[PDB]
């Protein structure tokens, strides 16, 4: 009943307060930050620019890359007054963008679900990654991972007829043979930062304050490089998620 | 270290009746509370004991929930049910409807008779059960030599007749799948004529229901030959 | 010796919601300490109880965080919210924003009203909740027959109105997926006219916010039909 | 009986960093005894604390294990190291050599200076550490406003200067992978001129070494961009 919104808050009632009624509440857990975000969701896909026997090289094709950034937020070959520089590794973008004329598909990669619904300012967690084959041919593929901020080491094949990506002390994966088609695994919160920005970082990324405003540095879970004969759908999963400082969700269009 | 395993020849195989569970994809989901509900039951067997109607065929061959008798002693039997779940006059009783989903049975069948003729009417019937070996009875006299009971009309309207479970084997097949066709017959005869006064409907109707008796059980769940309602 | 194993039919299968973990490739990694942080929360449900703004449409059809009243008693209702998470005037409230990610709900909705007209202004309103069955109310008189509360202006600026959870089922679907369209209406009426003195803005604005009440819960996490902000 | 198993989607997959062992094919093999050995160590981190040489560039641009000073107060700084593992004058120190195999660091860097000019020579230096935010210092005066220490020549030949770990984040990236380029600078200035007597070499050389301080740590093992020695 009667109250005062001015003070920053109000009585949070149930039927029994103003009327001859009562609390109808039942136990229920499924609405918890952790449990809720703890399910798999696609953010993009990987397409090999080259064989399992050669030297790897950044490669784009119809918005598809042979390498991808592990973050919920939007990403893509770095943008430029003259167009996204496709000869390079993807980076975090500040907005979502149509692949072409019509809205879909998207040029950018990201967790659309998480974007349309991230009721919070900061978050953190571990990331469980799943890489599933889109094709039906006996697979021969190599996958390389690296933590946020690490050298891409996108150098030349040392050993002929073998995959350059496999040539590293970093965590790499080798998948090959009939029936062997999906890669699954989990990586640690590997960022230099204490917590990550769910949406926006109200500051410059460089000391000169001239560049990339709104994007926090190393605000991601590292990245993936692929090589071999198979393209794959890539999904992420929020492990032991934690969120802070509540904020507004993505706007929804009012009915005409 | 990894555990070494021997992969059995039967791998990747799916079992319609596999005694085990599978993977859960939507956990921690509460099942909408239904504590208010009544009428719940656990055993299909109970449905079996609820007496339901036997379908008795007419000359023009159409069915009735009963049979008729009158002021006479028909030289032949009034009705005759063949103790055999597969059997047709039961085609549509709960007993048979449940039984056709199981391979074998054991125990007593209970035949229930209800007299709906006028209060002023009287008379007596002879209900009998004849086991195989000497062929089905062709006369009250013969029937009278097997298992039987006399049913006397009066104040009490009905009568529960039990076809005893008399058999070589501990169990019996529920279906006419190939041909030993039956497990004996239940035959109903007039002992004395239905008698009454002037001003009374001369032809009385006797409701005929059937059900599984107390002893009774079913086993081995299976599928019936598929059918289509008329 | 190796352990013999039976490989289940569902092998090699991937489950988006699999209740289990996978292989760790960068172990013993410390998670950058964040003990300094404040503002943390665990349950999406709480966000639901924070009152946020209802979008009220104008003739030229554009939205306001509120509605207006004046020195009159409009024969019809001032505003009318349809108790239904899917419902549009809520399209953009935290309550609805969270709710669209879940399949079902239960409990009270709380409608918060804040009077922003001048201190010198007075008057009374009649806020009501009408359950289905007899159609939506078309007159204060009818509304008055359902669940209602009178809101009196005065020193205290606001009012919390609770739309009771009255329903056949323990739960209710959160979305207009096919058509039973609603769970009743919340209607706001003038009881007495806004009254005031000369020198005062004749048209007062009443802020309209909505939120999940105390009893309230959501369940079964799902995906909304995908959308694109205008 | 065989144990039923659910075969996970990720089968047959190989993990370069898999936290587990594999199959042993030549068991019970004794490892040639080496109990006589000395010089053993367990933590790469220790190598990090052993001071090694900084490579100081000459006009014709070639490197020296040191820098020179004389009877003057150069208006600008004598040398300037950029606190940044990736940084080049350290390119060849054990500290940097180890650090490039790890993604992040934390703690103090220790800069070691050794005066090799003649015993008869004197003078004082001002070593300073400047954190970012206001740009790198361009004058002793400015440097003097940040973290600093005065180094006085005398009987004792050397000096250990600690670049404090002052940072927004608990950790810092070890490599110039994209561009925030640095974490501040270490600058060396003359406070007073090197002074001395006739018959003494006017230009003294100061050995410059660097190493990880006590507080210091590294984490997340990785691979550097591959290289080829000249």
């Amino acid at each position: 009943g009667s109250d005062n919104a001015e003070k920053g808050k109000v009585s949070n009632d149930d039927a029994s307060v103003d009327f001859v009624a009562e609390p109808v509440k039942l136990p229920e857990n499924q609405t918890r930050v952790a449990f809720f975000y703890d399910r798999a969701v696609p953010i993009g896909m990987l397409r090999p620019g080259q064989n399992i026997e050669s030297t790897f090289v950044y490669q784009e094709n119809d918005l598809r890359l042979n390498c991808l950034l592990l973050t919920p937020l939007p990403s893509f070959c770095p943008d430029s007054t003259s167009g996204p520089v496709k000869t390079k590794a993807p980076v975090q973008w500040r907005w979502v963008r149509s692949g072409g004329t019509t809205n879909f598909p998207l040029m950018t990669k990201q967790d659309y679900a998480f974007l349309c619904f991230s009721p919070f300012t900061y978050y953190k967690c571990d990331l469980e990654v799943t890489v599933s084959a889109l094709g039906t041919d006996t697979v021969a593929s190599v996958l390389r991972w690296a933590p946020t901020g690490a050298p891409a080491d996108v150098t030349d094949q040392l050993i002929g007829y073998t995959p350059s990506l496999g040539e590293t002390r970093n965590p790499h994966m080798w998948l090959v043979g009939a029936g062997n088609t999906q890669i699954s695994f989990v990586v640690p919160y590997n960022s230099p930062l204490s917590v990550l920005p769910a949406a926006w970082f109200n500051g410059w990324s460089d000391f000169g304050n001239t560049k990339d405003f709104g994007v926090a540095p190393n605000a991601d879970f590292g990245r993936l490089w692929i090589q071999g004969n198979t393209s794959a759908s890539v999904r992420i999963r929020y492990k032991k998620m934690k969120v802070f400082c509540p904020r507004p969700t993505l706007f929804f269009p009012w009915p005409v | 270290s990894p555990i070494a395993v021997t992969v059995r020849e039967h791998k990747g195989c799916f079992y319609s009746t596999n005694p085990d569970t599978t993977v859960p994809i939507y956990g921690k989901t509460i099942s909408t509370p239904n504590d208010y509900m009544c009428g719940e039951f656990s055993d299909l067997l109970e449905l079996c004991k609820l007496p339901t109607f036997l379908g008795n065929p007419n000359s023009n061959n159409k069915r009735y929930p009963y049979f008729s008798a009158t002021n006479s002693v028909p030289t032949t039997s009034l009705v005759d049910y063949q103790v055999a779940l597969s059997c047709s006059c039961m085609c549509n009783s709960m007993l048979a409807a449940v039984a056709r989903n199981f391979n074998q049975y054991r125990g007593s069948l209970n035949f229930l008779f209800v007299f709906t003729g006028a209060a002023m009417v009287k008379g007596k019937f002879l209900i009998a059960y004849t086991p195989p070996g000497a062929g089905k009875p062709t006369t009250r006299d013969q029937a009278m030599q097997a298992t039987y009971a006399i049913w006397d009309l009066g104040l009490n309207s009905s009568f529960v007749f039990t076809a005893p479970f008399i058999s070589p084997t501990h169990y019996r097949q529920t279906s006419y799948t190939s041909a030993a066709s039956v497990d004996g017959w239940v035959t109903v005869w007039q002992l004395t004529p239905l008698t009454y006064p002037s001003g009374t409907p001369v032809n009385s109707d006797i409701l005929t229901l059937v059900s599984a008796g107390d002893d009774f059980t079913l086993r081995m769940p299976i599928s019936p030959t598929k059918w289509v309602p008329q | 010796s190796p352990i013999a194993v039976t490989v289940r039919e569902h092998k090699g299968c991937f489950y988006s919601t699999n209740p289990d973990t996978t292989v760790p490739i960068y172990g013993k990694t410390i998670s950058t300490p964040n003990d300094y942080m404040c503002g943390e929360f665990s349950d999406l449900l709480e966000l639901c109880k924070l009152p946020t703004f209802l979008g009220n449409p104008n003739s030229n059809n554009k939205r306001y965080p509120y509605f207006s009243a004046t020195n009159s008693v409009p024969t019809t209702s001032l505003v009318d919210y349809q108790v239904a998470l899917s419902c549009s005037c809520m399209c953009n409230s935290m309550l609805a924003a969270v709710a669209r990610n879940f399949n079902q709900y239960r409990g009270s909705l709380n409608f918060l009203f804040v009077f922003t007209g001048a201190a010198m202004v007075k008057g009374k309103f009649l806020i009501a909740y009408t359950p289905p069955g007899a159609g939506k109310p078309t007159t204060r008189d009818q509304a008055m027959q359902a669940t209602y509360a009178i809101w009196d202006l005065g020193l205290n600026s606001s009012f919390v109105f609770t739309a009771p959870f009255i329903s056949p089922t323990h739960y209710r679907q959160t979305s207009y997926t096919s058509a039973a369209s609603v769970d009743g209406w919340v209607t706001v009426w003038q009881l007495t006219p806004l009254t005031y003195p000369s020198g005062t803005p004749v048209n007062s604005d009443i802020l309209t916010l909505v939120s999940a009440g105390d009893d309230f819960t959501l369940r079964m996490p799902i995906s909304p039909t995908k959308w694109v902000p205008q | 009986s065989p144990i039923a198993v659910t075969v996970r989607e990720h089968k047959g997959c190989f993990y370069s960093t898999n936290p587990d062992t594999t199959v042993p094919i030549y068991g019970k093999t004794i490892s040639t005894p080496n109990d006589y050995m000395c010089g053993e160590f367990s933590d790469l981190l220790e190598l990090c604390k052993l001071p090694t040489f900084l490579g100081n560039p000459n006009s014709n641009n070639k490197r020296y294990p040191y820098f020179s000073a004389t009877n003057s107060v150069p208006t600008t700084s004598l040398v300037d190291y950029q606190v940044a593992l990736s940084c080049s004058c350290m390119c060849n120190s054990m500290l940097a050599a180890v650090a490039r195999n790890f993604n992040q660091y934390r703690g103090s860097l220790n800069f070691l200076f050794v005066f090799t000019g003649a015993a008869m020579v004197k003078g004082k230096f001002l070593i300073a550490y400047t954190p970012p935010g206001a740009g790198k210092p361009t004058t002793r005066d400015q440097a003097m406003q940040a973290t600093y220490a005065i180094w006085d020549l005398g009987l004792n030949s050397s000096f250990v200067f600690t670049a404090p770990f002052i940072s927004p984040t608990h950790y810092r990236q070890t490599s110039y992978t994209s561009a925030a380029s640095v974490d501040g600078w270490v600058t060396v200035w003359q406070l007073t001129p090197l002074t001395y007597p006739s018959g003494t070499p006017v230009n003294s050389d100061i050995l410059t070494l660097v190493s990880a301080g006590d507080d210091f740590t590294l984490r997340m093992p990785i691979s550097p961009t591959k290289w080829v020695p000249q």
């Binding site: - | 085990d20 569970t21 859960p24 208010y36 | - | -």
Partner: peptide, 25 residues
Amino acid sequence: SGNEGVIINNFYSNQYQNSIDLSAS
């Protein structure tokens, strides 16, 4: 009660393996 005859029958927690039974009142 049902058609399940496996001893090691847990692996997945109960509450995940089955809908949770709860009484309104």
